[PDB]
Short mmCIF file of C-alpha atoms in Angstrom, two decimals:
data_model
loop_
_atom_site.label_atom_id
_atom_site.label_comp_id
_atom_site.label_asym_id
_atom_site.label_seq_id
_atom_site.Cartn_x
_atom_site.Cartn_y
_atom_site.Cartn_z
CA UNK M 1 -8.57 -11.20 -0.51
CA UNK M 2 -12.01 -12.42 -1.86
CA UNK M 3 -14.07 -14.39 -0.39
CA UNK M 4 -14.76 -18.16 -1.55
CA UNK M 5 -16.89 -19.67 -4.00
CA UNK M 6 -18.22 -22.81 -4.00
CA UNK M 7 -18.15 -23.37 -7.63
CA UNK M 8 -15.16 -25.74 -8.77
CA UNK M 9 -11.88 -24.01 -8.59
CA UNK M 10 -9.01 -23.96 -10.43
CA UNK M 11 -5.13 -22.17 -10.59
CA UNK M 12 -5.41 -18.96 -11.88
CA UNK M 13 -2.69 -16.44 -12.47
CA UNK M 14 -5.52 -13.70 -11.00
CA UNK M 15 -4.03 -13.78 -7.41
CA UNK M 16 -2.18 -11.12 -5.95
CA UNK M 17 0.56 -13.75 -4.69
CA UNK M 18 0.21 -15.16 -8.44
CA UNK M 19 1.58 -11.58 -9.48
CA UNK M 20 4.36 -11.23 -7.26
CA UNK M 21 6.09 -14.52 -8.16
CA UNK M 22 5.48 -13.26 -11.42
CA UNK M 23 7.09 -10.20 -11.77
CA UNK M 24 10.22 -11.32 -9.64
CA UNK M 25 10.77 -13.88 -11.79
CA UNK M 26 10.45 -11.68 -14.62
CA UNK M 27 12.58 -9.29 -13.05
CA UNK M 28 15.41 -11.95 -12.50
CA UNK M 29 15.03 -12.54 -16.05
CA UNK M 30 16.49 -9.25 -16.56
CA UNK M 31 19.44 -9.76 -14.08
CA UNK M 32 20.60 -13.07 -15.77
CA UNK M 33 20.17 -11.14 -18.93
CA UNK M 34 21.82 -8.21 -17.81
CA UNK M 35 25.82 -7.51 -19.09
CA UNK M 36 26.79 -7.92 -14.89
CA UNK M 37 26.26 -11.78 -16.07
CA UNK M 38 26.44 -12.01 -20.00
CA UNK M 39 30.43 -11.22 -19.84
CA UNK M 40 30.87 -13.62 -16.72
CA UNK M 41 28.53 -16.27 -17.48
CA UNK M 42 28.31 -18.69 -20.46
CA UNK M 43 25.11 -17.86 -22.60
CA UNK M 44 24.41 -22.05 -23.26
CA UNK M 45 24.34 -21.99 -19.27
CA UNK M 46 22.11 -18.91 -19.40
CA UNK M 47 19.52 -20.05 -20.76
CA UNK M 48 19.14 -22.75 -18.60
CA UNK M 49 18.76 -20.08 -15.73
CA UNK J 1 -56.23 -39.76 7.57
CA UNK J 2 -54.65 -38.99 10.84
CA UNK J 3 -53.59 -35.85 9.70
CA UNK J 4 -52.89 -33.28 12.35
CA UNK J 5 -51.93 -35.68 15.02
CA UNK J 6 -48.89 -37.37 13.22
CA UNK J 7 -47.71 -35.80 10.65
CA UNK J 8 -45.04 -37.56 7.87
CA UNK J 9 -42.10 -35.71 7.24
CA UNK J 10 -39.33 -35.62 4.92
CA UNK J 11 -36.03 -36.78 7.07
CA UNK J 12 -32.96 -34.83 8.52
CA UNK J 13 -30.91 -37.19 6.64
CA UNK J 14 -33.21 -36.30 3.04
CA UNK J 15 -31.74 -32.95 2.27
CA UNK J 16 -28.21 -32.46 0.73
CA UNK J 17 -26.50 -30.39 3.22
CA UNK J 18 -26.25 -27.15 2.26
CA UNK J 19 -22.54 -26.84 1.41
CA UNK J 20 -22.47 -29.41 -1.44
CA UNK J 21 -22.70 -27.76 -5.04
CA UNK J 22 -25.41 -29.16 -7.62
CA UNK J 23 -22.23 -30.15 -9.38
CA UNK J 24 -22.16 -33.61 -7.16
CA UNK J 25 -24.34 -35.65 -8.72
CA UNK J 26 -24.99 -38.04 -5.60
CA UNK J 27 -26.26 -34.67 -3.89
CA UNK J 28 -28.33 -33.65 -6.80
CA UNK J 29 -29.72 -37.36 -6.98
CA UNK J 30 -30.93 -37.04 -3.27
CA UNK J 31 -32.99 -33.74 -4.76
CA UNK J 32 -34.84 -35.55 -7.38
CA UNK J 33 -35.80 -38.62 -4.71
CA UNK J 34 -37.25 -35.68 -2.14
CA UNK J 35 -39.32 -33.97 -5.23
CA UNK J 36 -41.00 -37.12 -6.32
CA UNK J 37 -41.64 -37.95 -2.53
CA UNK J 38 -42.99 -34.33 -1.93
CA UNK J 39 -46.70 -34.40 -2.09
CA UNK J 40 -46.92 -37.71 -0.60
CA UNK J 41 -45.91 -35.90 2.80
CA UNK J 42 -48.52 -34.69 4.45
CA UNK J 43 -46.23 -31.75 6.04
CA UNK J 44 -47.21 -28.56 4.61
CA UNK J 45 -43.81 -27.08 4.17
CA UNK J 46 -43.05 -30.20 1.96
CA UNK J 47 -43.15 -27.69 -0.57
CA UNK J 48 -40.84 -25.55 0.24
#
């Protein structure tokens, strides 16, 4: 944590929480790209995941 | 004149409160109507 400002805020990816959505949904990335889903699943309905 | 046994102040209800930002202008326009009526007071902590 870190405390508050009172200058106008916006989103920012900075956040700790920010990161961990991140990187899970970069790691997902990797299991709909992995070959336990590219022989299974269609790649035009890959890409949409 | 009667300086010392009434003294003029600024009001309670003057100041911006001190969680608004200078970014609000309304807030920032109730700080230019308190310097302009500074001297005028005859409190002497007007000026600060």
């Amino acid at each position: 944590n870190q405390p508050l400002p009172r200058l106008t805020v916006a989103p920012t990816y900075d956040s700790a929480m920010s990161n961990w959505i991140s990187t899970t949904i970069a790691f997902f990335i990797r299991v709909v790209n992995s070959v336990n889903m590219t022989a299974t699943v269609n790649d035009l309905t890959r890409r949409t995941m | 004149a009667y300086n010392g046994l009434v003294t003029t102040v600024l009001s309670e209800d003057a100041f911006p409160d001190s969680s608004q930002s200078i970014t609000h202008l309304p807030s920032m326009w109730k700080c230019l109507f308190l310097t302009l009526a500074g001297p005028m007071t005859s409190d002497p902590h007007s000026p600060v």
